Design a protein around this nucleic acid. Structure first.
Lengths: 424, 218, 55
DNA sequence: GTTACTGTGGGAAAGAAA
DNA sequence: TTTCTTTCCCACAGTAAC
């Protein structure tokens, strides 16, 4: 087998030019209802696994242009529960660019307070891709319909975070539909599910877009605005009201929690709500009211479930062709600080999953790199000369990009961009 | 900018006889640059003329942070010797000078900071004490000094990881041993109920596993 | 300057050595780790193959 | 129609924390 | 005693294979 190849200057240049990164990606809920006895309360929403990036196709082509069945170059994939002695379920990714894990669940045999989904993943010909995991997920023995203080957070939606919303018809797992979006409007697919920014607003809020959001956790009664994290289309102002027994309360200050059934009131149109008619999303009014001036009964179909959402995302590139090992674990570079300046400039990098076998490249230049640990790494800013023939000092701003590169050639893109600047 | 050029490269004193002006890109003040380019005289002059030694730049670092990062012994002495100077300053990510001192393998600043009474059990936004960072980086000397000056050896970071655990993950045999020497609790699981021994077995760090299994028991 | 420079030479060498140690600790274990992963990849791939035959 | 089964959601029972 | 939280139980109402 062909020995591991050190990424070359030229190969880097090609990458910078084309840049067909391959990126896995895992969307999911932050909470999970533990299942008892021999039950099975599936994770809802179902952990989706998109495979974005022009690179995946380039990889498909490269593999075939080397003698591979349509079946030999097909990314495969299984999802599982961290280190649990169960069985990983397979995700069917044929033709599809993503795939949900509709029947994942966590038994009570598992004592962990948390866990993260494991997504194993290789190509058809057993060539290996890697193992990517979701952000941690907390286990709850049952949602708390009781009171919720503001000390045990992590369980309170907070202006800024994201959430998924789904409706459950008559207690039948096969009915479940999630507020989604396609073609520009809001669907209620029982197939896909979208993550929504849930911004909090001060009662004295305006009309539409270009508004200003304010920090703070969310309790019923406030004016929130839901936006599609992908498309952008958003629902006109609303007021999330705690519900129960088909009654959409008005006098409720309690802070909205995880997996809490709640109704969404509109922009003071009148008393119209947001409901699902076993099809799509359409207006409503909720006729019943004579129970009390603060307990408007509502028709079963707008008592959505709120659940907060996260998203794990990794991206790589085979810069020197196939590699004996997996591209996992992938390096995320969260912070990039400068250390000192001029003749000694150095760079401290902090992030996750760093490893002794990476060098950081400034544009097409490989810079000396010292591994501190999994989360910290140092490197030496290369003389400005390496980017401008004459220059013995920085005559003008020159911004090159920063990027991590494994030793066998995999190149992990960042987003950061070190910029040389004149030493004042 | 004019005062900054003299400090960063009679000049500092004459212009003074602006000051707290922040740059657009980095947001550093003249004191910050003096610290970064490690220009000792300039920092002294800026301080003399009642300068604020705690202005944060765009990432939250104060000149003292810049001082440790650039391993500028003189500006560092000057800032710690200064009374106003916050030694437990904080970057946006929660990082503190005591921590950078542990991380960048800089000679003595960690102890000088300790001796000058910096908080040792302070933590970053991830909840990692300098002792945790000391273990990640297997900086034994820093680990001993943090421990002698009363660090919490069994402290847990947001992910429930103890310092012994990070040493087990990275395979810091020497620091791991020191923590054991000090009776670090080797039975504290991380957030996913994982023992340091477990994280160690997984990473195939056989010696740390050997230690966890048989070193300084009962 | 030689005294300060000397402190500088000393710091990098320490970082440099620490790195060299970690990489070697990591590389020495690579085969053990890579062979264990492939063993699992094989098990699923085998299962991925039979799942296809059942159809 | 008939049968055997299976996620869910609501409420009783068992503990555990005040 | 209270107040919750974690485990148990069990019956709607859909599926699936006859």
């Amino acid at each position: 087998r062909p020995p591991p190849k050190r990424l070359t200057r030229e190969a880097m240049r090609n990458y910078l030019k084309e840049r067909g990164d391959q990126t896995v990606l895992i969307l999911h809920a932050k909470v999970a209802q533990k299942s008892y006895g021999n039950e099975k309360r599936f994770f809802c929403p179902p952990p989706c696994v998109y495979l974005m990036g022009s690179g995946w196709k380039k990889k498909k082509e490269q593999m075939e242009r080397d003698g591979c069945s349509e079946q030999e170059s097909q990314p495969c994939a299984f999802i599982g529960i961290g280190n649990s002695d169960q069985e990983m379920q397979q995700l069917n990714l044929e033709g599809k660019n993503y795939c949900t894990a509709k029947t994942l669940y966590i038994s009570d045999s598992d004592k962990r307070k948390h866990f993260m989904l494991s997504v194993k993943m290789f190509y058809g010909n057993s060539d290996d891709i890697g193992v990517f995991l979701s952000k941690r997920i907390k286990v709850i023995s049952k949602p708390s319909k009781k009171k919720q203080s503001l000390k045990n957070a992590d369980l309170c939606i907070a202006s800024g975070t994201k959430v998924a919303l789904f409706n459950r018809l008559r207690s039948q797992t096969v009915s479940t539909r999630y507020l989604h979006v396609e073609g520009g409007n809001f669907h209620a697919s029982s197939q896909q599910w979208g993550a929504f920014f849930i911004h909090l607003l001060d009662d004295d809020e305006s009309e539409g877009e270009e508004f200003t959001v304010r920090d703070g956790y969310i309790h019923y009664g406030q004016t929130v605005k839901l936006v599609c994290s992908v498309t952008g289309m958003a629902l006109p102002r609303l007021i999330i009201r705690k519900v129960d027994k088909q009654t959409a309360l008005l006098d409720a200050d309690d802070p909205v929690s995880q997996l809490h059934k709640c109704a969404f009131y509109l922009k003071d149109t009148e008393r119209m709500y947001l409901c699902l008619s076993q099809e799509r999303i359409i207006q409503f009014q909720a006729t019943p009211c004579p129970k009390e001036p603060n307990k408007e009964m509502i028709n079963d179909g707008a008592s959505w479930t709120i659940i907060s959402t996260d998203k794990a995302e990794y991206t790589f590139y085979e810069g020197m062709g196939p590699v004996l090992a997996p591209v996992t674990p992938v390096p995320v570079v969260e912070s990039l600080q400068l250390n000192g300046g001029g003749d000694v400039a150095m760079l401290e990098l902090t992030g996750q999953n760093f490893t002794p076998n990476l060098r950081v490249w400034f544009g097409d230049v490989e810079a000396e790199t010292m591994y501190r640990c999994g989360e910290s790494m140092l490197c030496v800013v290369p003389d400005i000369s390496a980017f401008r023939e004459g220059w013995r000092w920085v005559r003008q701003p020159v911004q090159v990009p920063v990027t991590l590169v494994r030793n066998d050639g995999i190149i992990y893109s960042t987003s950061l961009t070190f910029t040389y600047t004149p030493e004042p | 900018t004019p005062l900054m050029i003299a400090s960063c490269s009679a000049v500092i004193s004459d212009f003074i006889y602006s000051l707290h002006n922040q740059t657009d890109r980095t947001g550093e003040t003249a004191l910050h640059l003096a610290a970064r380019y490690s220009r000792s005289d300039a920092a002294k002059r800026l301080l003399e003329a009642s300068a604020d030694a705690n202005i944060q730049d765009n990432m939250g670092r104060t000149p003292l942070h810049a001082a440790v990062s650039a391993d500028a012994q003189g500006v560092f002495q000057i800032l710690i010797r200064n009374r106003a100077t916050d030694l437990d300053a904080r970057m946006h990510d929660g990082t503190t000078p005591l921590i950078l001192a542990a991380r960048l393998a800089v000679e003595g600043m960690l102890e000088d900071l300790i001796n000058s009474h910096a908080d040792v059990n302070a933590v970053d936004d991830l909840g990692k004490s300098a002792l945790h960072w000391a273990a990640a980086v297997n900086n034994v000397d820093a680990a001993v000094v943090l421990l002698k000056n009363g660090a919490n050896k069994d402290m847990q970071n947001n992910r429930e990881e103890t310092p012994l655990f990070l040493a087990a993950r990275e395979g810091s045999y020497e620091t791991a041993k020191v923590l054991l020497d000090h009776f670090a609790n080797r039975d504290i699981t991380d957030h996913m109920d994982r023992l340091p021994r477990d994280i160690a077995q997984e990473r195939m760090h056989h010696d740390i596993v050997r230690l966890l299994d048989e070193y300084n028991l009962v | 300057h030689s005294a300060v420079m000397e402190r500088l030479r000393r710091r990098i060498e320490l970082c440099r050595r620490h790195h060299s140690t970690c990489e070697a600790r990591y590389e020495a274990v690579s085969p053990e780790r890579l062979e264990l992963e492939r063993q699992h990849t094989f098990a699923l791939h085998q299962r991925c193959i039979q799942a296809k035959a059942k159809r």
